[PDB]
Design a protein around this ligand. Structure first.
Ligand code: KAN
Ligand code: 0JN
Ligand code: CL
Ligand code: NA
Ligand code: NA
Length: 272
């Protein structure tokens, strides 16, 4: 061959991409996350022969967040059912992410609507989580390991960003610094690393026609201990019953739940 190739030719302007102000055309609009942490979100609906869309707009540091979800959406969709990216734009202070909506209701909503199906619903969740954790880690370009997350948590703590009102019952009213200190007493342990979602909660898994058809909110996707996802989902199931909590582990394939790793990941999520 031949190296250090830097060969220039004259060219006319290429054909540029169709703009954002085009995909979104005939739609209704609604802000769905008023007062929350993160982007402005627009629900676009009501176009004949066109699917429902969401458009996230992040400004400043939140633009980095939206950019983070976009690349993770792009990567993970080869393995899992996710919203498809219709259009994404990054400028120096803004990011815009246009995605298709996944029809259906959240796992939380389905559990509430179908309480007599709790056990079948948890079975579906475990199968879906097993599918995610079966993606070979060698395929994943994203790091979500505990060293990375612990540094993010330290930062949020030092910047006053930890929501101390939202701690689990067993840490109710604890100072953030106490959670930090006690959490470190669970370390170290050997990670059992898999492709994790990062916020595998009942709000982020979508059911339609009785089947688990997708997951959303993938900005924290990356390689981490499997308990990162087990802990968050186990926690949510506590709003329903301890039997369903137990069932999650059993159906996922863990007979002997590692209480230390469970506790560690529950505590880590307090900071986020
Ligand atoms: N700050 C932003 C984050 O806020 C929530 O995450 C928080 C959980 O809600 C808390 O737990 C409470 O809610 C659970 C159900 O969600 C219940 O099972 C549990 N008993 C409750 O104590 C947990 N302590 C901390 C975690 N950061 C959202 O889910 C997450 O998407 C969002 O990014
Ligand atoms: C953009 C993001 C917040 C990540 N998102 N959220 C959902 C859930 C959801 C389902 C049905 C109606 C809703 C109305 C307001 C907010 C969310 C709704 C959702 C989804 N189904 N499909 C794709 N993205 C979704
Ligand atoms: Cl029980
Ligand atoms: Na997909
Ligand atoms: Na709990």
């Amino acid at each position: 061959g031949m190296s250090h190739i830097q060969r220039e030719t004259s060219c006319s302007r290429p054909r540029l991409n169709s703009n954002l102000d085009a995909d979104l055309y005939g739609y209704r609009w609604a802000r769905d996350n008023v007062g929350q942490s993160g982007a402005t979100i627009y629900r676009l609906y009501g176009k004949p022969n066109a699917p429902e869309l969401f458009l996230k707009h992040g400004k400043g540091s939140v633009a980095n967040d939206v950019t983070d979800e976009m690349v993770r959406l792009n990567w993970l969709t080869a393995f899992m059912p996710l919203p498809t990216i219709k259009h994404f734009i990054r400028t120096p202070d803004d990011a815009w992410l246009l995605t298709t909506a996944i029809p259906g209701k959240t796992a939380f909503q389905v559990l509430e609507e179908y309480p007599d199906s709790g056990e079948n619903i948890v079975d579906a969740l475990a199968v879906f989580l097993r599918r995610l954790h079966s993606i070979p880690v060698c395929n994943c370009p994203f790091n979500s390991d505990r060293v990375f997350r612990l540094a993010q948590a330290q930062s949020r703590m030092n910047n006053g960003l930890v929501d101390a009102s939202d701690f689990d019952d067993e840490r109710n009213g604890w100072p953030v610094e106490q959670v930090w200190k006690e959490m470190h007493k669970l370390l170290p342990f050997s990670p059992d690393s898999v492709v994790t979602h990062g916020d595998f909660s009942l709000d982020n898994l979508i059911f339609d026609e009785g089947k688990l058809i997708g997951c959303i909110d993938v900005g924290r996707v990356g390689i981490a201990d499997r308990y990162q996802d087990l802990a968050i989902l186990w926690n949510c199931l506590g709003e329903f019953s301890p039997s369903l909590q137990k069932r999650l582990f059993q159906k996922y394939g863990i007979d002997n739940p590692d209480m230390n790793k469970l506790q560690f990941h529950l505590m880590l999520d307090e900071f986020f």
